Design a protein around this ligand. Sequence first.
Ligand code: 3GR
Ligand code: 3GR
Ligand code: 3GR
Ligand code: 3GR
Ligand code: 3GR
Ligand code: 3GR
Ligand code: 3GR
Ligand code: 3GR
Ligand code: 3GR
Ligand code: 3GR
Ligand code: 3GR
Ligand code: 3GR
Ligand code: BR
Ligand code: BR
Ligand code: BR
Ligand code: BR
Ligand code: BR
Ligand code: BR
Ligand code: BR
Ligand code: BR
Ligand code: BR
Ligand code: BR
Ligand code: BR
Ligand code: BR
Ligand code: BR
Ligand code: BR
Ligand code: BR
Ligand code: BR
Ligand code: BR
Ligand code: BR
Ligand code: K
Ligand code: K
Ligand code: K
Ligand code: K
Ligand code: K
Ligand code: K
Ligand code: MG
Ligand code: MG
Ligand code: MG
Ligand code: MG
Ligand code: MG
Ligand code: MG
Lengths: 252, 252, 252, 252, 252, 252
Amino acid sequence: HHNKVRTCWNEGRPALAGWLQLPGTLHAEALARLDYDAVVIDMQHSPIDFGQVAPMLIAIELGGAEPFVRTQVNDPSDIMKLLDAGAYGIIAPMVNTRAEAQTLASALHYSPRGLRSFGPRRPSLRYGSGYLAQASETVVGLAMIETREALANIDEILSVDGIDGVFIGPTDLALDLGHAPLVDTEEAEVVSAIAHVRERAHAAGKRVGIFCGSGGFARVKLAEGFDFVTAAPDLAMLSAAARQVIADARAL
Amino acid sequence: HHNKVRTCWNEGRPALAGWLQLPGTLHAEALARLDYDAVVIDMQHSPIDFGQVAPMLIAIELGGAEPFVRTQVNDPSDIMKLLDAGAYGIIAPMVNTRAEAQTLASALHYSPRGLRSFGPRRPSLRYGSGYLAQASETVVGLAMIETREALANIDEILSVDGIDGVFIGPTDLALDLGHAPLVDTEEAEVVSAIAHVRERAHAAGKRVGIFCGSGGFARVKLAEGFDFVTAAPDLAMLSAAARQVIADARAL
Amino acid sequence: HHNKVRTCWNEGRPALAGWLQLPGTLHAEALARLDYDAVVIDMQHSPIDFGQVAPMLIAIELGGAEPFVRTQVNDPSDIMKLLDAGAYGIIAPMVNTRAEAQTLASALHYSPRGLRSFGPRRPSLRYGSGYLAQASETVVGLAMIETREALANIDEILSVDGIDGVFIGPTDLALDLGHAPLVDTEEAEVVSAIAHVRERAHAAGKRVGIFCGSGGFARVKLAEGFDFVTAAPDLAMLSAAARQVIADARAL
Amino acid sequence: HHNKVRTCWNEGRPALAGWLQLPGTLHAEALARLDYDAVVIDMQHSPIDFGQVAPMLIAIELGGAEPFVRTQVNDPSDIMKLLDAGAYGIIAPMVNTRAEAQTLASALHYSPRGLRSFGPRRPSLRYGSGYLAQASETVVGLAMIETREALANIDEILSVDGIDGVFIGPTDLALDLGHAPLVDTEEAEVVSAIAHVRERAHAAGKRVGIFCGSGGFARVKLAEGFDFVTAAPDLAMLSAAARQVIADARAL
Amino acid sequence: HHNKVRTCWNEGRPALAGWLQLPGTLHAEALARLDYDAVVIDMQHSPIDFGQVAPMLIAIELGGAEPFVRTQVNDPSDIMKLLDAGAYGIIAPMVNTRAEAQTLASALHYSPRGLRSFGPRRPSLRYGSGYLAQASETVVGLAMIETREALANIDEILSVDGIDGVFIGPTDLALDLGHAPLVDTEEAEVVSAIAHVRERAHAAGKRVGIFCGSGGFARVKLAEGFDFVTAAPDLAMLSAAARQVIADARAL
Amino acid sequence: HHNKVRTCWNEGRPALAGWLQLPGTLHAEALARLDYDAVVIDMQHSPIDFGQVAPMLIAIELGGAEPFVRTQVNDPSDIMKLLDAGAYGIIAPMVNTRAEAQTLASALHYSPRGLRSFGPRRPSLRYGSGYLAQASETVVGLAMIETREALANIDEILSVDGIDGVFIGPTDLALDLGHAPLVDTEEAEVVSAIAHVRERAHAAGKRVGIFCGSGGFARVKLAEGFDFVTAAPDLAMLSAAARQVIADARAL
Ligand SMILES: O=C[C@H](O)CO
Ligand SMILES: O=C[C@H](O)CO
Ligand SMILES: O=C[C@H](O)CO
Ligand SMILES: O=C[C@H](O)CO
Ligand SMILES: O=C[C@H](O)CO
Ligand SMILES: O=C[C@H](O)CO
Ligand SMILES: O=C[C@H](O)CO
Ligand SMILES: O=C[C@H](O)CO
Ligand SMILES: O=C[C@H](O)CO
Ligand SMILES: O=C[C@H](O)CO
Ligand SMILES: O=C[C@H](O)CO
Ligand SMILES: O=C[C@H](O)CO
Ligand SMILES: [Br-]
Ligand SMILES: [Br-]
Ligand SMILES: [Br-]
Ligand SMILES: [Br-]
Ligand SMILES: [Br-]
Ligand SMILES: [Br-]
Ligand SMILES: [Br-]
Ligand SMILES: [Br-]
Ligand SMILES: [Br-]
Ligand SMILES: [Br-]
Ligand SMILES: [Br-]
Ligand SMILES: [Br-]
Ligand SMILES: [Br-]
Ligand SMILES: [Br-]
Ligand SMILES: [Br-]
Ligand SMILES: [Br-]
Ligand SMILES: [Br-]
Ligand SMILES: [Br-]
Ligand SMILES: [K+]
Ligand SMILES: [K+]
Ligand SMILES: [K+]
Ligand SMILES: [K+]
Ligand SMILES: [K+]
Ligand SMILES: [K+]
Ligand SMILES: [Mg+2]
Ligand SMILES: [Mg+2]
Ligand SMILES: [Mg+2]
Ligand SMILES: [Mg+2]
Ligand SMILES: [Mg+2]
Ligand SMILES: [Mg+2]
């Protein structure tokens, strides 16, 4: 009866989340049962459509992590349908302006704070009759910062009330700056921008997150004060693990 | 226009294969593009049903590994439908007797060698008009040895003409012997049985395979002369990788 | 070869429709065979995506009710794809302005009345070669009135030619007015607004519908003159029925 | 970390279960959250295949009822795959002989008690490292008694160690006796047979269950001492509820 | 309220049926609306599993042809589940003996004529309360004759009461005789065997069918007196049509 | 490691493509293996949703044609998700203005040429580490011209840099001009408009395509100089083929 990520924050610690680009419920449950506070399902850069995401949300909740979705787009009705299917965290890509951030916020709250349409099929099952009064608190929302334009507008994005803060997409950000879209990059301009976004988010009293490609980079980000750190995509972890098993198997 | 595992064998080397318990095409293609000769899809201990296996076979072939299936059961019509969907390797569980091995063989060959029903939807697309004449060679079949009874009958199982040999299921085998179902076990009685099956398979001029849970164990099995070595299940590799990313991320 | 709801209207009676939030074809057909003129599939507050709605439309038609969809959003291309999949009634949520009502109308008619794209896969199978000439009549469209803003703009919404009228979403409407989102509410301000919308719809010579949560409320709405009354959601009816079976079973 | 039905029994009370013929997770979770100890998914007389049952098992567990399956057939490998997908109760239809009952039992226990193949994908996630030692206790198995032949062999069926008892299929039983296949029948010969099966099951110290079509009949069966009572199918409850809503809506 | 194929027969004409190896509802409905009396869905040599066949049965019925299935195997519980999903014709492959023909018949009739389990989800919706009394007549069953063994046993297969007759699988039959598995073959031994099966079926007062690969061959078979003629597989027709469109498009 | 359609163009010949309105992988692979340079999957006038398109892209690539999609709408995030699923050609419907053409172009190129978001799940598997540098060349984009408005704006649409040119939708175009939406029409005004669009596309040094309903019409279009010609929809070809098989079968 609490959003596990909001509970981390309220208790003075950051949240660590998984990141899924592969459809299906078995690995979603298995990863959720690990020491992840949340598991994010990626609906942008994956083959995961709505019909596949819906059972995954159930599986993550059963496993004991908060189900989050990184949506394909910042679209209010898409977001609302995920909320009603038991997505309790929403990370919306490519939020570049205050207005777009206000569109995200509008989907996450009922009237009068937002315009979320009422029909909370799965949240009502989870939270019971008192859901409406606590509904906003049950959902975490983060706007993604992934372009030079979003960088330019970061303080104004951060001034939007109905979102908890921002989530950096560092490979898109690197690419828009003219650099290779390398995860966990050391490119100075990208590193500088990432720090700046974190500094501005905290100056505004908001939360800041970042997508990580390794456990070591994630540790550093937590030490730097990021409130929400993901590490690492299921497909990338599995590929790397398989490459290593093959190398070990085929070694002389 | 050749079965990649049979090509390994014909060229004097063993085959290394992947092992999938998670449904979906993206990781299947990605793992197939690694230095695996085959990728086995597990339809026994997984949620993978026929509707999910069918696109995975396509994805593995595109990725450049031979698509194999470990079936739910040694059932001829199930096996035939997979063959016609472009499974080119069949590993049938719990083959305990010569008769059961003859049932497996019967599904893998057309008349007069077997009773496979004719309608090769995807093999005909892959191999063209000459498929019928080469059809038996396009498919690898292995009977699984997983019980004390299968151990007792190993020479008779190995005497069946229409299968390439046997595939050891070492966790089931350990359990039937009264030991913990540990993968890559060191339990002497299980290790002894595994060696014995390999020795008998080669004494019969047949192929022998084994399921491995790690790259190091797989290396040893290849050195011991196993012809077909799988390593390691996608779900197990992904779980272990995630546990390590989390440990690294949360370390002080 | 007629839209069953339009036939009710043309013959001087209202239409009673079912309302489905559960995916699947078996209950859709079974409910369609009851004395429902239409069955509405809810794609907003449900886990029903396009891949699941498509066979349900077939099942409702076979069962003998007109297949309707309440869409996730008032989006023209989404609506057109449903029309071509054999949705013959469209209820679009959250239609708040004349312009948004004109967007809905544009999707429901071919040129020159609208901009519906031509490729009527299933309507052409149902209606044959004469489909094009009668296509507009084969589809019912209703704009949903669910906010204070939609209330403010009701006469202008009702002035849009290409829609048959409006469909009240009374739980959203109650919530936007600051009241509990109770179905079949007695809250005076909400009841007053609902009556007003009905009065304005009929003053404009248009049709008016309303979502009901019970058979008794639905009877009253029909008596008040609503032209299209839904009652009641499959999930709500099933839950209530199960609660009662359990109470009866566990009673002393 | 306990099978909820076995816990009822161990604590001196019967279990009441739901019964689902409609695929999908939303109603499965919603019904599971009611005061049902278990929810049975019917894979015999429904369109529910393996790909649809798998997420339903997850949803029922999350909702707080024990997930059960009435299988299509008493087939060991089918049953094992459901066990590994997190079915914790198995009701097998048309168990007519001691041998068939022994086949059911063989699938539900690992060696040496049975021949269940080892790869417990979801039970291991639920129960953790100690699963193997408690695995038999985590699963309930019931053989269905549905024919004159099963009646003739009831004591011998009941003598099989590895099943908890029997589950009466009273419409099939009525039909095989030459009577209408009416649920909750009053036909004396069928009523007499049902009582006899219950009496013999308890004389053998085993559990007995029965499929019910109403809450009142279910109450009587619990009073008569049945240990496992289902009531009533989702589709039948929903159909009846819809018929009543329509009758109420269309009444003058 | 009648099986369209049985109506052909009762009215003194043969039945012509379609044959589908491609999953999906759109072409199934479209072909059903043509002058086919039935459409057969092939679950043996196709990727069509149960989850895909179920909506196709609905679509064929809506289109106005009798839905038939050629099953993967002659398995009673598989057949019963299709019957309850609204398959009204069953063609079972590889029926080689009287006993196997008796197994097929047993699945198609309720007690006392057969052992079909009672739960007719979709037939009860189609036929209403009087279904039970007419259930046998609503289903057509044909045993496939596809091997030398089935040829050897043809009179005994034909003596089985509960099946309408036999359906020749001529490519399998050719292959078992040592000839190329060519559809619509002119190979004398195969042609002779096909005629013999027809002659014996009619000498027994039973129905006989045959799979055809072209409209011309199908015409000849109807003229020779076959009672049930299929022509031709959707995939084969579509492939041939596409080849011709390409040849026409690329011609100088 | 090349887009097959771009290779046609670079080598001085047009491309001929298939057109699929039926979901599924088997016919997609089979048609791809014919002498089609590309196969277009229609997501506008079909029941093909994202979950169904994804495996079809894999199947077309394996078959040896370039996978293209005609999307439901010109929506950047929809297009990006298809690109990352291995759509290598995008045909966007109802592109009516320069601005809408610029929206299409923006989705097809990474920064700085466009705003495509980075996460190329399947293109990176196909093209390897050098993908980013060649990514724009791997994708073909065409804007559809289907209205009087698009005709009015054709030169301005053609002036957009990031698209290869335009694709005529001639049935929509005919309908918007007030004529019957006949494929391969002879209506002078429509024929004149089609020629004009081709002439303007080539005057701008861009590519022009057209949807054809027959091989003969397609031949003429290639002779007239169209660079990308589709012929003909799978459903239309299959329907016509079945009608002819039935006519031949039922002829005296
Ligand atoms: O739309 C209204 C609610 O979602 C019905 O449950
Ligand atoms: O459960 C949902 C809300 O609390 C009802 O108003
Ligand atoms: O069954 C015969 C063949 O499979 C038809 O293609
Ligand atoms: O392609 C299949 C076989 O070769 C035809 O006989
Ligand atoms: O787009 C054109 C039509 O839909 C083709 O059937
Ligand atoms: O069927 C569709 C239309 O009537 C053809 O113009
Ligand atoms: O078959 C062996 C086990 O299931 C692998 O996880
Ligand atoms: O989790 C499964 C078993 O307990 C491992 O032996
Ligand atoms: O099994 C009994 C019947 O199918 C319940 O509807
Ligand atoms: O509908 C099914 C049967 O007729 C009921 O006995
Ligand atoms: O979003 C970032 C990338 O897609 C992660 O793989
Ligand atoms: O594979 C994708 C790109 O080339 C990495 O930058
Ligand atoms: Br952990
Ligand atoms: Br699902
Ligand atoms: Br990464
Ligand atoms: Br590698
Ligand atoms: Br598929
Ligand atoms: Br392992
Ligand atoms: Br009724
Ligand atoms: Br479907
Ligand atoms: Br309600
Ligand atoms: Br309750
Ligand atoms: Br699932
Ligand atoms: Br019932
Ligand atoms: Br026709
Ligand atoms: Br379905
Ligand atoms: Br053929
Ligand atoms: Br060709
Ligand atoms: Br897929
Ligand atoms: Br066409
Ligand atoms: K956790
Ligand atoms: K490989
Ligand atoms: K009706
Ligand atoms: K419960
Ligand atoms: K017909
Ligand atoms: K090709
Ligand atoms: Mg990004
Ligand atoms: Mg095993
Ligand atoms: Mg609403
Ligand atoms: Mg029964
Ligand atoms: Mg055959
Ligand atoms: Mg068009």
